Amino acid sequence: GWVIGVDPDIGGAIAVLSPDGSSQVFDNPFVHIVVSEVIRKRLDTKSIIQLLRGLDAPPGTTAYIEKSSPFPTDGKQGWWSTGFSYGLWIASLVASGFSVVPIASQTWKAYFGLMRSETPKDDSRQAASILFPDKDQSLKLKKHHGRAEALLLAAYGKGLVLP
Amino acid sequence: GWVIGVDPDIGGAIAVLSPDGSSQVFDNPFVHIVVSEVIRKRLDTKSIIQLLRGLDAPPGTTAYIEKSSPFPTDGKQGWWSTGFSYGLWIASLVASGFSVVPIASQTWKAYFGLMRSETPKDDSRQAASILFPDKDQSLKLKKHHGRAEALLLAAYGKGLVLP
DNA sequence: CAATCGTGGGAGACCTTTGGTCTCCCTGCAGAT
DNA sequence: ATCTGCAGGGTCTGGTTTCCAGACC
DNA sequence: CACGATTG
Numbered sequence: 001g002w003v004i005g006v007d008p009d010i011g012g013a014i015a016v017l018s019p020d021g022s023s024q025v026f027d028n029p030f031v032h033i034v035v036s037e038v039i040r041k042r043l044d045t046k047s048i049i050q051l052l053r054g055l056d057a058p059p060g061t062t063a064y065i066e067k068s069s070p071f072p073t074d075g076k077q078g079w080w081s082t083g084f085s086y087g088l089w090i091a092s093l094v095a096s097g098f099s100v101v102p103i104a105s106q107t108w109k110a111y112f113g114l115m116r117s118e119t120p121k122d123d124s125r126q127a128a129s130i131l132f133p134d135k136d137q138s139l140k141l142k143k144h145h146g147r148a149e150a151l152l153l154a155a156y157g158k159g160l161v162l163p
Numbered sequence: 164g165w166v167i168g169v170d171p172d173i174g175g176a177i178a179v180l181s182p183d184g185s186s187q188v189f190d191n192p193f194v195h196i197v198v199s200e201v202i203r204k205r206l207d208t209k210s211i212i213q214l215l216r217g218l219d220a221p222p223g224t225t226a227y228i229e230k231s232s233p234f235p236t237d238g239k240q241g242w243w244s245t246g247f248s249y250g251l252w253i254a255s256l257v258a259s260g261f262s263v264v265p266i267a268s269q270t271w272k273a274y275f276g277l278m279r280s281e282t283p284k285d286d287s288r289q290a291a292s293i294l295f296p297d298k299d300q301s302l303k304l305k306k307h308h309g310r311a312e313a314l315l316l317a318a319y320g321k322g323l324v325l326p
Numbered sequence: 327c328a329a330t331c332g333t334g335g336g337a338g339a340c341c342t343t344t345g346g347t348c349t350c351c352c353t354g355c356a357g358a359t
Numbered sequence: 360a361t362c363t364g365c366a367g368g369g370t371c372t373g374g375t376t377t378c379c380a381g382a383c384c
Numbered sequence: 385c386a387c388g389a390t391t392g
Contacts, residue, residue, distance in 0.1 A: 074386070080233065080386090095259065105382090231352090240369080241354085269339060
């Protein structure tokens with residue numbers, strides 16, 4: 001009945017689907033940090049864990065998380081940060097009682113027919129709006145594709161289908 | 164009082180110092196994982212959380228953790244893994260109730276007079292043997308430097324000094 | 327704040343002290359015992 | 360099982376597959 | 385994707 005979806009990146013999000021069909025999606029909490037004398041964004045460990053502790057999803061609920069798979073052409077910092085986000089979320093989810101299933105981007109994109117798209121981010125928001133019409137206003141912006149990815153991971157995990 | 168030290172990497176370890184002077188150190192739990200058709204060690208998230216939950220250190224105890232600082236010349240996989248281990252430990256520690264204080268390796272090495280050695284791993288084990296003589300048997304092997312780093316991080320936060 | 331674009335990048339602590347100097351890991355995989 | 364050495368590296372799902380093709384942040 | 389930077 002309950003399913004969680006997590007886009008773990010800095011502009012990512014967590015989506016919670018209840019058995020009555022309602023849904024919530026939360027932007028990933030972050031803070032601004034100093035590194036090598038510049039500012040950078042970092043996930044907010046305590047707010048994530050606090051977020052997970054107030055969810056109504058019971059222990060045992062499966063959380064489907066986007067598998068970390070950076071391109072070899074991405075910088076060493078890209079690799080560090082996606083590795084870090086992944087581990088922070090995985091530990092946080094496990095410590096808060098949820099079962100964690102990593103899902104490759106190719107898996108849920110094939111499942112919703114999103115593969116090989118020229119506008120993959122827009123498409124993911126369009127698909128999330130169709131599957132979660134009451135979230136349509138929370139998906140209007142280009143920067144909301146993180147919210148879309150989370151909802152689509154949860155929708156994948158629940159076995160939802162597009163019309 | 165109570166202090167925790169964490170070497171977060173795959174051969175790392177967590178050390179726990181109690182107020183009566185006694186000490187425990189545990190090797191970091193790991194599992195073997197298939198990745199891109201080869202086998203790789205990865206930290207064991209469940210076992211880490213379970214270990215933290217069995218510690219007698221009370222809530223709010225400070226956990227000193229080695230800051231992740233990979234070299235610009237380490238490969239992107241190096242960056243991903245150290246980022247991943249760091250995030251996994253930080254979240255496990257916050258979620259289990261401990262305060263987290265990252266410590267740069269240069270900080271506890273300067274504190275114990277270990278800067279600029281040509282056998283830094285052996286030296287770290289030697290220093291932790293002197294600080295924790297009842298752990299001397301658990302530091303015999305060169306692969307035990309991670310146990311030594313965890314113990315020294317904890318010794319740093321407790322303010323211990325070498326004779 | 328929201329978008330977009332192009333390339334892929336250390337970070338840290340203390341000093342010489344408002345910028346300079348110098349220090350620091352680890353992963354992943356072959357091979358030897 | 361422990362260690363030594365050395366350069367710094369994608370990974371993943373469908374292939375009704377035996378390593379390939381194509382795909383992804 | 386992250387990391388900078390620019391542009392309304």
